[PDB]
Amino acid sequence: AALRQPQVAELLAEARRAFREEFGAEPELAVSAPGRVNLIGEHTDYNQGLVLPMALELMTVLVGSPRKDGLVSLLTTSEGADEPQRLQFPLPTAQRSLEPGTPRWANYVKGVIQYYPAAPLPGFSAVVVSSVPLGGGLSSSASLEVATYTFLQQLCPDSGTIAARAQVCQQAEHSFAGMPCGIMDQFISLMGQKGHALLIDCRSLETSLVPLSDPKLAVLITNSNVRHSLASSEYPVRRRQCEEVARALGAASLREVQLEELEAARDLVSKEGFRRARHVVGEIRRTAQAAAALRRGDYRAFGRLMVESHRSLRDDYEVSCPELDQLVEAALAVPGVYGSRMTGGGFGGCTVTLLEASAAPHAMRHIQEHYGGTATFYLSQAADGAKVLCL
Ligand SMILES: O=C1CCCC2=C1C1(CCCCC1)N=C(Nc1nc3ccccc3o1)N2
Numbered sequence: 462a463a464l465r466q467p468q469v470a471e472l473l474a475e476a477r478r479a480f481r482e483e484f485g486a487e488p489e490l491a492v493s494a495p496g497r498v499n500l501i502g503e504h505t506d507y508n509q510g511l512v513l514p515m516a517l518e519l520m521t522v523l524v525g526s527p528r529k530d531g532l533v534s535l536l537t538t539s540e541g542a543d544e545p546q547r548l549q550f551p552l553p554t555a556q557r558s559l560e561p562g563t564p565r566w567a568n569y570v571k572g573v574i575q576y577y578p579a580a581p582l583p584g585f586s587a588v589v590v591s592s593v594p595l596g597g598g599l600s601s602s603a604s605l606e607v608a609t610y611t612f613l614q615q616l617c618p619d620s621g622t623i624a625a626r627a628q629v630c631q632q633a634e635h636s637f638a639g640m641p642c643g644i645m646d647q648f649i650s651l652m653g654q655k656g657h658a659l660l661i662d663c664r665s666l667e668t669s670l671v672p673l674s675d676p677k678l679a680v681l682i683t684n685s686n687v688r689h690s691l692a693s694s695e696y697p698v699r700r701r702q703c704e705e706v707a708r709a710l711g712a713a714s715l716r717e718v719q720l721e722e723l724e725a726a727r728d729l730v731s732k733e734g735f736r737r738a739r740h741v742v743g744e745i746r747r748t749a750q751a752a753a754a755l756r757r758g759d760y761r762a763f764g765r766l767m768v769e770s771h772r773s774l775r776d777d778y779e780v781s782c783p784e785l786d787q788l789v790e791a792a793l794a795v796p797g798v799y800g801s802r803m804t805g806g807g808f809g810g811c812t813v814t815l816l817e818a819s820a821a822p823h824a825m826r827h828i829q830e831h832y833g834g835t836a837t838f839y840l841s842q843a844a845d846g847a848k849v850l851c852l
């Protein structure tokens with residue numbers, strides 16, 4: 462069966478009670494930011510490509526109050542978070558900046574604080590809760606970054622765009638978590654809307670809300686519950702390989718490159734380099750094609766495109782793994798399934814499946830039975846982005 466997904470009210474209540482017991486007073490502020498699944502458009506965001514994620518009902522919630530002593534005091538109740546579950550530190554200054562360290566979960570909060578553009582930022586007390594599986598492939602860290610950003614805005618309103626907010630959270634990921642992500646994760650956490658996926662053009666930063674609310678249609682997320690170390694170390698390698706190919710062809714990015722141009726300049730790049738670029742160029746196309754298909758309500762074409770995306774990721778970009786592949790192959794054997802593919806960075810994490818709603822229970826049974834391991838399932842509607850509630 463699919464794991465329960467606590468409503469924001471439940472996570473709010475848990476966070477509020479925790480805060481009350483922890484700090485001896487009621488919290489004054491509450492925010493939430495969702496994790497996400499990427500329907501299609503993988504390893505294209507840092508290539509100034511197209512991506513089509515949707516926000517999940519899985520989310521991170523922060524409750525808290527401003528302090529008058531310029532200190533930051535944190536507590537998380539998430540099991541899976543590394544010890545200690547509490548941390549305190551003074552606000553950064555011009556002379557002293559925050560630094561990444563232990564516990565790692567606090568690095569995301571520290572990073573957002575460090576690069577928060579508006580001032581004066583006061584200190585604060587906060588409790589962090591989440592229903593997003595920590596490092597499970599659904600951007601738990603993006604949701605924490607965006608939840609944190611959304612909280613800091615209540616303490617000290619910025620005056621910029623939503624893209625600038627995503628880039629701040631992205632810089633936190635780069636500099637405090639050592640993960641040089643693209644913009645997708647933060648952007649969808651910020652900009653998600655219930656009942657819609659979000660087509661993001663990562664070159665222009667133009668975004669389009671694409672309706673995705675059809676009873677009869679379901680999105681099944683399957684967690685492999687594995688994560689090879691390559692997910693961390695091979696990710697930056699992929700970025701460098703794409704940059705090298707773009708540089709060899711005199712292109713600002715692979716978004717400017719088409720398959721024909723790529724093959725014509727085959728002698729100018731490495732064998733594997735060609736494989737990487739071919740995926741990227743094809744995946745941008747497929748995402749454009751997927752967006753249109755989803756518009757038409759053509760789930761069969763959308764599904765077929767998801768499958769091409771996985772095969773490309775598996776064979777050209779080489780960021781899949783036997784676990785993900787077995788999960789995909791299993792799902793495609795189930796009647797009523799339109800398509801299935803690995804989602805997110807790869808080397809573990811989740812797959813995403815588009816299927817007839819009625820097929821979801823039978824999909825879960827069969828996928829689990831064919832998965833030589835322990836799969837976890839989520840059935841998720843397209844959810845809202847970051848929100849605020851005054852307490
Ligand atoms: O293992 C690393 C590397 C792989 C990516 C992954 C991290 C960990 C680092 C800290 C310990 C758990 C795993 N954190 C998540 N993100 C996260 N989101 C959170 C929301 C609320 C509370 C805590 C949270 O941690 N991402």
Ligand SMILES: OC[C@H]1O[C@@H](O)[C@H](O)[C@@H](O)[C@H]1O
Nearest residue numbers: 503504642643644646805806
């Ligand atoms: O599509 C692959 C994705 O991998 C994620 O892990 C990363 O945070 C995103 O920015 C995007 O690059």
